[PDB]
Design a binder for this molecule. Structure first.
Ligand SMILES: [Mg+2]
Ligand SMILES: [Mg+2]
Ligand SMILES: [Mg+2]
Ligand SMILES: [Mg+2]
Ligand SMILES: [Mg+2]
Ligand SMILES: [Mg+2]
Ligand SMILES: [Mg+2]
Ligand SMILES: [Mg+2]
Ligand SMILES: [Mg+2]
Ligand SMILES: [Mg+2]
Ligand SMILES: [Mg+2]
Ligand SMILES: [Mg+2]
Ligand SMILES: [Mg+2]
Lengths: 58, 170, 205, 293, 159
RNA sequence: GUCUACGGCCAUACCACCCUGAACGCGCCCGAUCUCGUCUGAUCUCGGAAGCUAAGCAGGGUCGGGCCUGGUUAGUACUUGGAUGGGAGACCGCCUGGGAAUACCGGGUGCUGUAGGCU
RNA sequence: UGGAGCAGAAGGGCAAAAGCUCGCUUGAUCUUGAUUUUCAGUACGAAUACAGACCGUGAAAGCGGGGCCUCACGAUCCUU
RNA sequence: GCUGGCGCUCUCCGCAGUUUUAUCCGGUAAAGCGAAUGAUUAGAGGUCUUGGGGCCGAAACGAUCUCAACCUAUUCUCAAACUUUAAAUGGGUAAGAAGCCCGGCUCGCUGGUGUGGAGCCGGGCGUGGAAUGCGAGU
RNA sequence: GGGGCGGACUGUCCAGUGCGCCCCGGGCGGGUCGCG
RNA sequence: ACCAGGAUGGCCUAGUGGUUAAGGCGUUGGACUUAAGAUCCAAUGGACAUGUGUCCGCGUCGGUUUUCGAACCCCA
């Protein structure tokens, strides 16, 4: 009892029924996978942006 | 007038005794090359195994040495005094080098000792002009140029005008 | 022994030459591709006639030998023993297979190399004969007889060229005279105006 | 005979190397590891001390690599050591030290870091490395480019290196390659390196030759006699040279003048001329037969 | 079935071009890749490290991370019926700056440069690029010569 | 007009042979005390400047090879889409757009960045 | 110009090398996360960029957390 | 994965089984073998780079012919596991307000350098920056 | 195309080929402007 | 046909890990005997079936050929 092994026949129709959507790009994307040294220093910069708050208002 | 740098000079005299088997019979050939050249020679290994010769790979079967300076000149005059200043026309290579072979090293004037024996050896003379070391320098290596090369018919002329040698036909 | 040529008439498979991946291939039945005076000069046999295929089909090596025997026999009969030069311009390179069945069925049904068969296109020359100009009807009847050894439709075309050359028969002789073609055995060598001048001096000395 | 190797197909399949490699002037394996910055540093210049020994001149350059080419920041040669007093020996280890120190002082004066980062004002020849003073600008940091020079102990690229780090440039190095480092005991002798820096290896050779062969002394140091440089003045002459280098290391440009626009090469020959030349050659070869017969 | 090997079928893709083997030219390494920069992926076979997989060769992405010898790139990759935004790590040898965005940057610089002036001169410039219009009505001068007469050639059997 | 040091592009730069090369330079060249490393100061490393462009190198030359860029090949081959087009088929023609590659025949033969020389 | 070699199958890659010969070594070490590959976008395996140690090596730039890449392998329960 | 239902969040900028303008990617068709690898047909032109022999010599690259290989240019026919070339169709990306342009802070990362990068704040600029179509998102 | 000066270069017969500056004779080619 | 093997002096067989060509019979030469066998003293010979790959080096290992023998070819 042999059978059909593989096809991609109706698949392009099934992919397009609900559409082939592009992935949702929104601004401020996540920081997973960025360099840990760079991210640790970026968190120090964000931690101390309140320090020069008087120079900003001045 | 030719330039002083087109003058041919002996680059090196390369002597080897190819014994064909290792051990004491090769160390005594090393002592022959030492008493001939004033320096310790280096042994050369067999590249592969041929049973018809009795050699195995990486077995020291020859010894060789290179001499330059006035010492190459002196040992070459020794070699031609053995060979009676006769060379055959086919002894000169296509690139302007020549050579010969000695059947017995004590014919050169090395005193015989019982601790060594008698070894024949092999003489090769590499000639050059000044400037031949630019193919061997590291920084800006080049080819030596066509008009600067040594022809066979020029090395034969240098030999006959430098040792009064007789180039035997055939 | 071997199947009729209608089993392997059409170029259905991809090309399958003998190589390091196809071994155990028997030699082609055709071996000699040139008959007649091979040593004849380029000015001795000016008239060339081609047997040109008209189909994208496959000619067996057995047929390529049968047609060259038929054409060779008529040209030695009609032009005499050496008055022609036949060049078969197909060499059988495409190996045809066979799945011999005396049971396995179509299990593992990849063939062993049965034979060698050449591939010809629409408009590709199968056989060429060069000879003297007066042997034209003998050329045409030789290719017309050799036609029957071949499947499919072949035309006989008297070529515009001069023998087995890429140059036209009308322009040929005066461009030999101007030293643009030097005759070199069977054909010619073209001399362009592009080499070192020492070749021009050697040609025009 | 022989199948010719340099046929048409050989030059069809020939891939020529880089021009600098074909000339021999560049190790691209070294240059890739040496000039390229890490990519998270973003146009931060990576600085090199190119040190090149020619037959009559040592060249010390400070460079950084760009896409459009290497950008030289500072350069110092040995032919300007006659201005500071070193008339003779423009390619010895002492001249290598002098031009490394001159490159260092010229670059620091250009960046404004001359009075800071003075290096070893007295040369004692040991291990020294400058350090960043807080509040002040951080020290200039570059890496040595020896090129193809075989970095054995006593190479003059390390004399230039020692001149730069005694001028005040932060270059990573060890003392394994300075002359005076003993290979068997694995120790470094600063006094022997001080003799090599002050040229007390070559004055020893002049004292060696003036007792053995006066004529070989004559032919070995000929411009030393003409410039009247003796074995006894070598240390203080190099000391006065180093003091003059740190006194005034700025370089003055040799002034440009007008010339009469003289061409000294053959101009490239035109298409009309190269057609006419081969037509003339054909006509001459044919007349050398129709006049011979 | 096939094999799931990483470089399966990359015989010509990761190979070097003809007479382009050996030393990688060093301004490949000297190019500045910022965050957000748009680059093209093309796997060089000289460098076996940092090599992108064959499904990224000829894809264009956005750089999200920069390290010493490599960058992280967000790459659109179609996986059957969904497009995923890939976070891949690939070395500097296998990427090159895309020129598809730096002509849009040329267009925005000449569009803000045509908004900011001609506004004080009062006229109106065009910024949306229209497609290739129908060709305008024009006169064709046949000065003297009559248009050359063409006929189909007789069929001659060439060879 | 050009060179040196470092390069980018990596033959329009390579290869073969030949001719020229002012000035600085680059070199060849002289030597082995020191540093250093070799069977060998040939290489590498060091200390020099008597000699010379012979070589490298630079610039030209070759009805030069290669390379680069065009024409031809050729709207050919191939090809997207179409027909109740043809043909027993093999395959072919047309409509609709797209469109090559040899042989063959022309042209070219390193540009250029930073720093510093020479005229 | 590689027509050799790189342990092997084949393919790719490689010439002051990735090959051959020496010198020194143990990055074939410890520890998080992220990613690619098969993929369901799960694991294993394999791989890739990082980061934190501690080292090796080199004059240094750097390079190295196995083998130039594509292969060379293994969950729960139990045992040790 | 396809499907239905239940919704929900907005709308009354966004997106597209499409083209265009840009820009990369590819090694299939074709073509090539006077181009690498492999296969392969035929003559021709050369000499010693070797050999097989007739003939003249002790013999001699001494003379003498061939015939082979060998080399140099051509030529015939080719390749899914060859390729210098190299399509058509095709696959990414971009075609703006999440964008540009000034000013100023933070950083323990970077380090000649108020350097470089990154993150924060404040301000300015709407001709909504290809064609066509359509409400989308979850 | 011609003339003048300055040079470079080539041909196994004096003969020939570019290049630089200046002048004339223009023909031509279409663009831009003015006049009928 | 598929699987598993096997090819070595004249015949019959050995033979690896990779370097040694082995043994019996036979053949050959000389002794013993009147002579021949038996007996005694000795000697030679191997297309290692072919070519290819690995290796320094193969009869030996690994894939392909050419001759041979063995087992299986079942349910209808
Ligand atoms: Mg199924
Ligand atoms: Mg088929
Ligand atoms: Mg190095
Ligand atoms: Mg010397
Ligand atoms: Mg010279
Ligand atoms: Mg010269
Ligand atoms: Mg040419
Ligand atoms: Mg320049
Ligand atoms: Mg680490
Ligand atoms: Mg390794
Ligand atoms: Mg369980
Ligand atoms: Mg493919
Ligand atoms: Mg094809």
């Amino acid at each position: 009892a042999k059978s059909k092994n593989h096809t991609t026949h109706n698949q392009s129709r099934k992919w397009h029924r609900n559409g082939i959507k592009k992935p949702r790009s929104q601004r401020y994307e996540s920081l997973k996978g960025v360099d840990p040294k760079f991210l640790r220093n970026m968190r120090f910069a964000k931690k101390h942006n309140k320090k020069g708050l008087k120079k900003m208002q001045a | 007038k030719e330039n002083p740098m087109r003058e041919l000079r002996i680059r090196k005299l390369c002597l080897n005794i190819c014994v064909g088997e290792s051990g004491d019979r090769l160390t005594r050939a090393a002592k022959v090359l030492e008493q001939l050249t004033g320096q310790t020679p280096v042994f050369s290994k067999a590249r592969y195994t041929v049973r018809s010769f009795g050699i195995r790979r990486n077995e020291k079967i020859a010894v060789h040495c290179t001499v330059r300076g006035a010492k190459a000149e002196e040992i070459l005059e020794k070699g031609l005094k053995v060979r009676e200043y006769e060379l055959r026309k086919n002894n000169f290579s296509d690139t302007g080098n020549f050579g010969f072979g000695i059947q017995e090293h004590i014919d050169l004037g090395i005193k015989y000792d019982p601790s060594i024996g008698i070894y024949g050896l092999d003489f090769y003379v590499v000639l050059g002009r000044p400037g031949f070391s630019i193919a061997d320098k590291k920084r800006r290596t080049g080819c030596i140029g066509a008009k600067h090369r040594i022809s066979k018919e020029e090395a034969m002329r240098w030999f006959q005008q430098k040792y009064d040698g007789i180039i035997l036909p055939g | 022994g071997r199947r009729p040529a209608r089993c392997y008439r059409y170029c259905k498979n991809k090309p399958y030459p003998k190589s390091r991946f196809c071994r155990g291939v028997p030699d082609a039945k055709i071996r000699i591709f040139d008959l007649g005076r091979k040593k004849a000069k380029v000015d001795e046999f000016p008239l060339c006639g081609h047997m040109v295929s008209d189909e994208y089909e496959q000619l067996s090596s057995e047929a390529l030998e049968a047609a060259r025997i038929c054409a060779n026999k008529y040209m030695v009969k009609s032009c005499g023993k050496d008055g022609f030069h036949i060049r078969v311009r197909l060499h059988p390179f495409h190996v045809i297979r066979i799945n011999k069945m005396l049971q396995t069925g179509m299990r593992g049904a990849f063939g062993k190399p049965q034979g060698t068969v050449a591939r010809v296109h629409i408009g590709q020359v199968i056989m060429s004969i060069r000879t003297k100009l007066q042997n034209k009807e003998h050329v045409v009847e030789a290719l017309r007889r050799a036609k029957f050894k071949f499947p499919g439709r072949q035309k006989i075309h008297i070529s515009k060229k001069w023998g087995f050359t890429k140059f036209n028969a009308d322009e040929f002789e005066d461009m030999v005279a101007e030293k643009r073609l030097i005759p070199d055995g069977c054909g010619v060598k073209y001399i362009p105006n592009r080499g070192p001048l020492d070749k021009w001096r050697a040609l025009h000395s | 005979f022989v199948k010719v190797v340099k046929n048409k197909a050989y030059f069809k399949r020939y891939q020529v190397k880089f021009r600098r490699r074909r000339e021999g002037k560049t190790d691209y394996y070294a240059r890739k590891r040496l000039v390229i910055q890490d990519k998270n540093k973003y146009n931060t210049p990576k600085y090199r001390m190119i040190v090149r020994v020619t037959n009559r001149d040592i060249i010390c350059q400070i460079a950084y690599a760009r896409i459009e080419g290497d950008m030289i920041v500072c350069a110092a040669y040995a032919h300007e050591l006659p201005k500071y007093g070193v008339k003779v020996g423009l390619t010895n280890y002492a001249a290598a030290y002098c031009t490394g120190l001159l490159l260092a002082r010229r670059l620091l004066n250009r960046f404004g870091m001359d009075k800071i980062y003075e290096g070893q004002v007295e040369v004692t020849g040991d291990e020294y490395n400058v350090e960043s003073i807080d509040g002040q600008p951080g020290a200039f940091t570059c890496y040595l480019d020896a090129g193809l020079a075989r970095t054995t102990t006593g190479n003059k690229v390390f004399g230039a290196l020692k001149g730069a780090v005694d001028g005040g440039l932060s270059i990573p190095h060890s003392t394994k390659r300075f002359p005076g480092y003993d290979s068997e005991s694995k120790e470094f002798n600063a006094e022997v390196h001080r003799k090599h820096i002050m040229g007390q290896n070559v004055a020893d050779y002049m004292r060696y030759l003036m007792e053995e062969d006066e004529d070989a002394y004559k032919k070995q140091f000929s411009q030393y006699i003409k410039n009247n440089v003796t074995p006894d003045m070598m240390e203080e002459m190099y000391k006065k040279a180093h003091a003059a280098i740190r006194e005034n290391p700025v370089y003055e440009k040799k002034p440009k003048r007008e010339v009469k626009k003289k061409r000294w090469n053959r101009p490239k020959m035109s298409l009309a001329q190269k057609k006419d030349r081969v037509a003339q050659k054909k006509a001459s070869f044919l007349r050398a037969q129709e006049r011979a017969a | 079935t096939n094999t799931k090997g990483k470089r399966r079928g990359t015989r010509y893709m990761f190979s070097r071009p003809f007479r382009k083997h050996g030393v990688v030219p060093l301004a490949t390494y000297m190019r500045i890749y910022k965050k957000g920069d748009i680059v093209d992926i093309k796997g060089m076979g000289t460098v076996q490290k940092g090599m992108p997989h064959k499904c990224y060769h000829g894809k264009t992405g956005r750089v999200y991370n920069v390290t010493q010898h490599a960058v992280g790139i967000v790459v659109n990759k179609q996986v059957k019926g969904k497009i995923l935004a890939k976070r891949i790590n690939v070395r500097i040898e296998h990427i090159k700056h895309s020129k598809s965005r730096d002509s849009f940057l040329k267009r925005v610089k000449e569009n803000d440069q045509k908004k900011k002036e001609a506004k004080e001169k009062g006229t109106w410039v065009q910024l949306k690029r229209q497609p290739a219009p129908p060709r305008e009505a024009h006169f064709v001068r046949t000065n003297g010569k009559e248009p050359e007469l063409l006929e189909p050639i007789p069929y001659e059997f060439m060879a």
